Design an enzyme around this catalytic site. Structure first.
Site, short mmCIF file in Angstrom:
data_model
loop_
_atom_site.label_atom_id
_atom_site.label_comp_id
_atom_site.label_asym_id
_atom_site.label_seq_id
_atom_site.Cartn_x
_atom_site.Cartn_y
_atom_site.Cartn_z
N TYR A 60 21.31 -63.19 -52.33
CA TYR A 60 22.09 -64.37 -52.74
C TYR A 60 23.58 -64.05 -52.84
O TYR A 60 23.98 -63.10 -53.53
CB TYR A 60 21.56 -64.80 -54.10
CG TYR A 60 21.97 -66.17 -54.58
CD1 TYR A 60 21.42 -67.32 -54.04
CD2 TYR A 60 22.86 -66.30 -55.63
CE1 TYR A 60 21.76 -68.58 -54.50
CE2 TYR A 60 23.22 -67.56 -56.09
CZ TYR A 60 22.66 -68.68 -55.52
OH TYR A 60 23.00 -69.94 -55.98
N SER A 130 17.58 -57.95 -52.83
CA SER A 130 17.50 -59.04 -53.82
C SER A 130 16.64 -60.18 -53.28
O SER A 130 15.46 -59.98 -53.00
CB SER A 130 18.90 -59.56 -54.23
OG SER A 130 18.87 -60.29 -55.47
N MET A 131 17.20 -61.39 -53.14
CA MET A 131 16.40 -62.47 -52.57
C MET A 131 15.91 -62.14 -51.16
O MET A 131 14.89 -62.66 -50.71
CB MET A 131 17.17 -63.78 -52.56
CG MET A 131 17.39 -64.36 -53.94
SD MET A 131 17.99 -66.03 -53.77
CE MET A 131 18.25 -66.48 -55.49
N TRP A 155 14.11 -59.75 -55.66
CA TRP A 155 14.07 -60.89 -56.58
C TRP A 155 13.18 -61.97 -55.96
O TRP A 155 13.32 -62.30 -54.78
CB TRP A 155 15.48 -61.45 -56.77
CG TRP A 155 15.64 -62.53 -57.84
CD1 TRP A 155 16.15 -62.37 -59.09
CD2 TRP A 155 15.35 -63.92 -57.69
NE1 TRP A 155 16.17 -63.58 -59.75
CE2 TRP A 155 15.68 -64.55 -58.91
CE3 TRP A 155 14.82 -64.70 -56.66
CZ2 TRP A 155 15.52 -65.92 -59.11
CZ3 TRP A 155 14.66 -66.07 -56.87
CH2 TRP A 155 15.00 -66.66 -58.09
N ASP A 176 19.30 -52.74 -63.45
CA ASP A 176 19.39 -54.06 -62.85
C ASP A 176 19.22 -55.14 -63.91
O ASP A 176 18.18 -55.24 -64.55
CB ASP A 176 18.29 -54.17 -61.79
CG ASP A 176 18.48 -55.32 -60.85
OD1 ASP A 176 19.06 -56.35 -61.24
OD2 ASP A 176 18.07 -55.17 -59.68
N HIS A 208 21.95 -53.51 -59.85
CA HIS A 208 21.39 -54.39 -58.85
C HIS A 208 22.02 -54.23 -57.47
O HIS A 208 21.39 -54.56 -56.45
CB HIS A 208 21.58 -55.84 -59.28
CG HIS A 208 20.96 -56.82 -58.34
ND1 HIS A 208 19.59 -56.96 -58.21
CD2 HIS A 208 21.51 -57.69 -57.48
CE1 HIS A 208 19.33 -57.89 -57.32
NE2 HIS A 208 20.48 -58.36 -56.87
#
Length: 261
Positions: A60, A130-131, A155, A176, A208
């Protein structure tokens, strides 16, 4: 003999270095050219051969610049690797899964002959930050044909990845605060089946954004995982099993080693 082995015999030093032993070239993918994703950069070995292919998604707000180092580094160990931009930087994980899928198809079917001829289209992998890591899990759940998945500080709102059968290495970051390991990475690792090839590597002293910063641990274990599973290269089992189960570097390492040698 394993027909998919590439490169010289590995050592820890060779895997920790900034660059692997393959000279690498790049092919840009414009947004115009890309169908179903936002373009990107394909890194590939100069030396002609067939190699496994890997698609990597940012997270993201992220662009391909945030994952470029990983694309180049992995390609330099003998892989064709596309670092993508997404349709928009705010796309959610399940959208990123579709975009990873489109990027794999792009390399196989739509890139130049220089790229397409260097890919064994039966040996594919996905990674993401992440995403984008969430997207990697989703696509792995949909595509049991993939040879490996590497979610980096992943994520996703869904925690249940019991449907995934693709060899999966999850890399978490102890500090994170965006995708905390307690509520993302670890729930994902634990819901993956016990019966599959999997591992969980938690970085020590990492935020993160560790995956967006050149990192010898991420580099070493990502390459070793891709080698073992995309190339069936059992020369790399040694790094994964027993693995780093290393203060200052690795907070913990779990696995289902030895992965049916």
């Amino acid at each position: 003999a394993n027909p998919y082995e590439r490169g010289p015999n590995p050592t820890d030093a060779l895997l920790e270095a900034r660059s692997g032993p393959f000279s690498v070239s790049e092919e840009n993918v414009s947004r115009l050219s890309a169908s179903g994703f936002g373009g990107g950069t394909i890194y590939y070995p100069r030396e002609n051969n067939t190699y496994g292919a890997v698609a990597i998604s940012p997270g993201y707000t992220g662009t391909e610049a945030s994952i470029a180092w990983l694309g180049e580094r992995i390609a330099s160990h003998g892989f064709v690797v596309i670092t993508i931009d997404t349709i928009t930087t705010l796309d959610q994980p399940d959208s990123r899964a579709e975009q990873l899928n489109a990027a794999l198809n792009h390399m196989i079917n739509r890139a130049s002959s220089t790229v397409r001829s260097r890919i064994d289209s039966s040996r594919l992998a996905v990674m993401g930050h992440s995403m984008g890591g969430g997207g990697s899990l989703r696509l792995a759940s949909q595509r049991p044909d993939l040879k490996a998945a590497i979610p980096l500080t992943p994520w996703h709102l869904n925690k249940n990845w019991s449907s995934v059968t693709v060899p999966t290495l999850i890399i978490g970051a102890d500090l994170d605060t965006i995708a905390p390991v307690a509520t993302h990475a670890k729930p994902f690792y634990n819901s993956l089946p016990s019966s599959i090839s999997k591992a969980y590597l938690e970085l020590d002293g990492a935020t993160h954004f560790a995956p967006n910063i050149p990192n010898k641990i991420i580099g070493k274990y990502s390459v070793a995982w891709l080698k073992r599973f995309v190339d069936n290269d059992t020369r790399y089992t040694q790094f994964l099993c027993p693995g780093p189960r290393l203060f200052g570097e690795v907070e913990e390492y779990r696995s289902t080693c030895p992965f049916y040698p």
